């Protein structure tokens, strides 16, 4: 999700 | 402007992922990695209600133009359409083969557009919940999707470094925008008047494009953005500003025309991932990640 870095 | 902290909204148990003000200005909706959507009073920050149903973290939530519905995008690979007043999940949109990251209703709120880690953009019918079209839009996760003023166009952004404009009816790619470098595009949206597109790239830069001419008109710098997909806004209730969160835990505000930084809001203890501007009052909502977990309301 957005809260995690891709 | 002179934005000052007025309220801090605590409730989410994990990083907040997005915040949006309802078009009628009454509420603020927030989504979080805690799998929940929360509603708060836009003026007093008073907690209103919690909407649950997603099986995994949520990355985005958006309001229908009449403020009656919400659509959320989750890592559970679905989007859910919710009736805000009742809290009911009207439809669960299934079709993406990977995490759904971004979503928005079109102006008529009869369609929903979504972007996924499956590298596609999907267009759904709100009433039936069926997918109408699937666009093989990008070659990396889609970070943002937004309809233009009349809903005839969709703009999408991706980690593939591109911003693409699609014809809603035909699904054809009408334009691809990219500058002299190819950093991931982490956010994009049309301006209120629909003439421009504001795009964020993971090289600490925000850019205002005249998509018709395919030219970059303004660049906004000074903040930190190299890791997260941080939202950006057009503030129009008072002075015309550009607003955005930053990885240095601050909210940045720029003069849209001069590109100068006019204010920086301090208070959050972690990355400010999302900001939203109230439709009629000079109010800004900001949300932060895991080490913070709160939403803050600022007024000028």
């Amino acid at each position: 999700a957005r809260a995690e870095v891709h | 402007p002179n934005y000052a902290l007025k309220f801090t909204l605590a409730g989410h148990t994990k990083a907040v992922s997005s915040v949006k003000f309802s078009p009628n200005g009454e509420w603020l909706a927030s989504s979080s990695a805690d799998k929940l959507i929360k509603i708060w009073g836009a003026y007093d920050g008073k907690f209103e209600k919690t909407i649950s149903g997603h099986k995994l973290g949520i990355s985005d939530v958006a309001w229908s133009s009449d403020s009656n519905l919400l659509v959320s995008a989750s890592d559970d690979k679905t989007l859910k359409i919710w009736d805000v007043s009742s809290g009911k999940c009207l439809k669960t949109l299934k079709g993406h083969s990977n995490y759904v990251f971004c979503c928005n209703f079109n102006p008529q709120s009869n369609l929903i557009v979504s972007g996924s880690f499956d590298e596609s953009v999907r267009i759904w019918d709100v009433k039936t919940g069926k997918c109408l079209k699937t666009l093989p839009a990008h070659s990396d996760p889609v970070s943002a999707v937004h309809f233009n003023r009349d809903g005839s166009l969709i703009v999408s952004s991706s980690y593939d470094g591109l911003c693409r404009i699609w014809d809603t009816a035909s699904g054809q790619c009408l334009k691809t925008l990219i500058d002299d470098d190819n950093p991931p595009v982490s956010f994009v949206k049309f301006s209120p008047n629909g003439k421009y597109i504001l795009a964020a790239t993971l090289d600490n830069t925000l850019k205002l494009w005249d998509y018709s001419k395919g030219k970059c008109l303004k660049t906004y710098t000074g903040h930190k953005n190299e890791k997260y997909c941080i939202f950006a806004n057009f503030s129009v209730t008072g002075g015309k500003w550009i607003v955005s969160g930053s990885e240095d835990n601050l909210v940045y505000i720029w003069n849209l025309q001069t590109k100068e930084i006019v204010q920086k809001l301090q208070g959050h203890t972690d990355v400010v991932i999302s900001t939203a501007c109230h439709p009629t009052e000079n109010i800004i909502a900001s949300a932060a990640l895991e080490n913070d977990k709160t939403i803050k309301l600022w007024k000028s």
Side-chain angles (χ1 to χ4, degrees):
Chain A
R2 191 179 298 266
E4 300 177 57
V5 179
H6 174 62
Chain B
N2 63 302
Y3 282 87
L5 183 59
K6 298 297 181 179
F7 303 109
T8 291
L9 292 48
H12 284 297
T13 58
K14 291 190 178 183
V16 182
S17 56
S18 82
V19 289
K20 307 284 178 62
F21 280 107
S22 60
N24 68 186
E26 292 289 290
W27 317 102
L28 182 75
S30 60
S31 61
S32 167
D34 68 10
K35 310 179 297 301
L36 307 177
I37 291 170
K38 288 177 180 290
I39 308 298
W40 323 72
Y43 309 101
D44 51 35
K46 179 182 299 300
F47 175 70
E48 181 75 346
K49 64 196 294 176
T50 299
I51 297 173
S52 67
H54 272 122
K55 294 181 65 183
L56 293 173
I58 301 171
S59 292
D60 202 5
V61 66
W63 295 89
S64 57
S65 58
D66 61 8
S67 302
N68 289 317
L69 311 178
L70 285 173
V71 59
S72 49
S74 170
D75 269 20
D76 62 18
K77 301 190 288 194
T78 77
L79 290 115
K80 283 174 178 290
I81 301 180
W82 316 85
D83 179 68
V84 179
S85 63
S86 68
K88 295 177 182 178
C89 173
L90 301 181
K91 295 291 184 182
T92 296
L93 309 181
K94 293 195 165 184
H96 279 299
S97 55
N98 211 323
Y99 310 154
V100 191
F101 198 76
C102 48
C103 55
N104 262 313
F105 282 90
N106 61 347
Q108 282 185 167
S109 295
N110 61 305
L111 297 181
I112 284 167
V113 61
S114 59
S116 170
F117 264 56
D118 65 16
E119 310 181 0
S120 75
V121 167
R122 279 175 178 256
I123 302 173
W124 318 72
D125 178 78
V126 171
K127 59 175 288 61
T128 65
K130 72 169 68 67
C131 186
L132 299 177
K133 279 191 174 63
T134 298
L135 316 179
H138 293 281
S139 58
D140 272 308
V142 182
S143 57
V145 289
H146 185 57
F147 281 97
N148 72 329
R149 203 166 185 294
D150 76 325
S152 61
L153 303 175
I154 290 168
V155 62
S156 64
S157 55
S158 167
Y159 273 80
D160 66 9
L162 311 175
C163 169
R164 280 177 167 167
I165 297 179
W166 312 83
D167 182 276
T168 303
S170 70
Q172 64 187 301
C173 184
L174 303 179
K175 189 164 299 180
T176 290
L177 298 178
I178 179 169
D179 216 343
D180 65 74
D181 200 359
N182 62 179
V185 187
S186 50
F187 180 73
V188 69
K189 82 181 300 179
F190 284 99
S191 59
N193 56 45
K195 296 179 180 179
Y196 319 103
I197 62 169
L198 179 63
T201 42
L202 297 183
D203 62 348
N204 319 105
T205 310
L206 273 163
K207 292 179 180 176
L208 186 68
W209 295 74
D210 180 310
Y211 68 83
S212 179
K213 290 65 184 61
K215 298 178 65 291
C216 177
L217 304 179
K218 306 283 183 180
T219 297
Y220 306 95
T221 51
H223 58 134
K224 186 182 180 304
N225 189 195
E226 307 179 315
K227 297 181 178 181
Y228 303 91
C229 288
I230 299 179
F231 294 79
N233 327 285
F234 288 83
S235 180
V236 303
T237 53
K240 299 300 175 299
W241 328 111
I242 290 299
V243 179
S244 172
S246 179
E247 280 154 25
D248 60 358
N249 311 345
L250 305 172
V251 173
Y252 281 72
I253 307 181
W254 293 263
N255 176 302
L256 190 154
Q257 299 298 168
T258 72
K259 297 162 290 178
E260 299 182 59
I261 294 175
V262 295
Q263 192 177 185
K264 296 183 295 184
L265 315 182
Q266 182 177 59
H268 282 293
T269 62
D270 201 355
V271 177
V272 178
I273 192 70
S274 176
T275 51
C277 299
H278 193 275
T280 61
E281 298 291 343
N282 300 311
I283 301 175
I284 288 173
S286 60
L289 300 185
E290 203 65 33
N291 298 174
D292 182 310
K293 303 185 184 181
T294 70
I295 297 161
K296 290 178 180 292
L297 289 174
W298 320 72
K299 299 183 179 181
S300 178

